[PDB]
Write a protein that binds this ligand. Sequence first.
Ligand code: 9F2
Length: 265
Amino acid sequence: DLADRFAELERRYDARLGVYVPATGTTAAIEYRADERFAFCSTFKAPLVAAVLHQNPLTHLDKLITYTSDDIRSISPVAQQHVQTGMTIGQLCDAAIRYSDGTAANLLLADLGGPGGGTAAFTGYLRSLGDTVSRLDAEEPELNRDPPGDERDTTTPHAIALVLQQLVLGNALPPDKRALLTDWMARNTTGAKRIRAGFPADWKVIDKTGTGDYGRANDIAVVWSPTGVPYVVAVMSDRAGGGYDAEPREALLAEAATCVAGVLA
Ligand SMILES: CO/N=C(\C(=O)N[C@@H]1C(=O)N2C(C(=O)O)=C(CSc3nc(=O)c(=O)[nH]n3C)CS[C@H]12)c1csc(N)n1
């Protein structure tokens, strides 16, 4: 009744919903529209922090990068207050995952690929994870604004769930660098009402969200059962037929996570 239960979700919230859960030795693949393209939005900041972590020693995380107030072109609740102090890369990483800071991600993009090669550098990182589907093409804020059906700035639930499976659970990042990434997303302040609300409290959830135009609302997550058996949930949604200013529904992401928790009992 999987596809039956998610289709109702789509009818009730008037939304396109994408769901992927990788197969495990015990559980099978939960896949609803898993190979359709959904806009990254702020979800890209999580594998982007991984990219900066992978390309640099830990001594790089304490490098002072200096920006201006003119450089805050988007929702940057952490970078807003450090207009003069600059920010250590480890803090921009912190701002990128936990507070979805846009100016952080734009400075993190430049540290990775330079002034004009940041998007392509980030896309090539995902290539190195075997993700040949996703693409970042724009920087903040325009990556949240691409029209529907456009392939630019898009991933799929399948590809981002497989990517995230290598970062937290796989051997893509070294033990210590992975630890800092697993901690950052477990400290995130944005995903309370998405996948967190649908998994029981004695389950452990780590997540990075994305929200954007055309009603776009995403939550990428790794979940941990009370027995410690781990899963990676990718939930992606938009309400294109609503228009650019359509209202994202967080409770949509919540219910989809409730359904996947029900089959993971
Ligand atoms: C051009 O950029 N447009 C954006 C945008 O910057 N999106 C980013 C993104 O993915 N972000 C995320 C997040 O990570 O989910 C968030 C966090 S979600 C959230 N938390 C709150 O406490 C709250 O009161 N409201 N919201 C929405 C906000 S926008 C930023 C946008 C936001 S809503 C919309 N229609 N567009």
